[PDB]
């Protein structure tokens, strides 16, 4: 815990989970008479701090999330990076100390939020910025006290990612099995449920309240997932993630790649067990990628977010992303700020109605999707395909004729394509 500097400084706080980085530290800071802001990526976590802080420190802090804002008049304020960004960044409140919790997060919202703080804090009159994380870049998953780890072998009743799982290890007790995809979760759950195992699947879109709080159960899930009280965690050791492919067909492609998990993934997955009692962790693979790297698609995602949700100009987003990149000790990505800024700067005059639809649909890159939809509508051309991503253009379907003026690829392109649209040619110059 960095002492409050005489002048503005940015500090890194590397301390293990449970050490109080997002609770004890801000409590000690505020007790010294400071206005402290704690930024966290999770809406659930942010809300949770309220009760924990009250119980642990007799503090009722202000809570700011997209769903609910609870103002208490406390010197401590907990907020998600999203809400912070939405409240205008440093102009949304006056804080002396900003704790950027879980600063290892490589999701667009955390990166944009951190960069905002790094760029704005000093000028806004803050005294200290703390980048806190139990897993700084270059991290690896080191032995845990309560967790026995054991490799899966080829011996077992259930084939699992090249290895196999012995029914005996899951027959009694509560266990958590991590699969990389929802299909695999379903398939495994089905397999086990057939073998008499009380297996239930869980992933984004499902209902977590159906998972029993007590009693034997094998939850087969993705990273979407809680008082699990799991006797063991079995991990596939791989993860699906967004990746950009500068494919020049005609421009770029944002898809997904199944990669070996990194240290954050392994630590968090393994971390579901051994909570206040011994646990077992079974794995298919012994390796993991050191934490600390993130894909350029995240940068694209940051610009998309500024445009879709934060009223930010690509030039403005660049200022924040630049600050993030200028500060040592944070996760790293390839310096593609000029490139992505170039791309988004040309995506002018979007259809406001499509945008509102796309960001309401939970579309991953709402600005890119809505923009491609805009270009199609204006050309009375059909979307790249008729997959759910293009529901916005359904009502107009009968009128849409001709080849799709393809801007980039966000999915499968089934319709005929034209590369003559001005925007397509523009983005192509960004590739050169």
Task: Give your account of this protein's structure.
Residues 268-279 are annotated as: RNA-binding. A motif (DECH box) lies at residues 101-104. By secondary structure, the protein is α/β, with parallel strands linked by helices. The chain has 3 domains: 1-135, P-loop containing nucleotide triphosphate hydrolases (Rossmann fold, 3-Layer(aba) Sandwich), CATH 3.40.50; 136-238 and 260-291, Rossmann fold (3-Layer(aba) Sandwich), CATH 3.40.50; 240-259 and 292-432, RNA Helicase, Chain A, domain 3 (Orthogonal Bundle). It has 13 helices and 19 strands. The protein has helices at residues 24-30, 43-57, 81-86, 108-120, 168-171, 182-194, 263-270, 296-308, 314-326, 337-345, 352-358, 366-379, 422-431; strands at 9-14, 36-40, 62-64, 69-70, 76-80, 97-101, 128-133, 147-151, 158-160, 163-165, 174-178, 199-202, 217-221, 232-235, 238-245, 253-260, 279-283, 404-405, 417-418. The strands form 5 sheets. The chain has a 7-stranded mixed beta sheet, sandwiched between helices. The protein has a 6-stranded parallel beta sheet with strand order 8-17-14-11-13-12. β3 (62-64) and β4 (69-70) form a beta hairpin. α8 packs across α9. The longest helix is centred in the N-terminal third of the chain and has 15 residues, at 43-57. The radius of gyration is 23 Å and the shape is globular.
Oligomerization status of the protein chains: 1 chain of a larger assembly
* Radius of gyration over all CA atoms, rounded: 23 Å
Strand order of the largest sheet: 1-7-6-2-5-3-4
Q: What helical percentage do the residues reach?
A: 25-40%
Q: What is the count of helical runs?
A: 13
Named CATH topology of the largest domain: RNA Helicase, Chain A, domain 3
Broad structural category: alpha/beta
Overall CATH class of the largest domain: Mainly Alpha
| Total individual domains | 3
Strand content: 15-25%
Question: What's the number of extended β-strand segments?
Answer: 19
CATH A-level architecture of the largest domain:
Orthogonal Bundle
Report the end-to-end length measured between terminal Cα atoms.
47 Å
Considering the protein shown, what is the CATH homologous superfamily of the largest domain? RNA Helicase Chain A , domain 3
Overall 3D shape:
globular
Biggest sheet details? 7 strands, mixed
Subcellular location: Host endoplasmic reticulum membrane
Organism: Hepatitis C virus genotype 1a (isolate H77)
Cofactor: Zn(2+); Mg(2+)
Protein name: Serine protease/helicase NS3
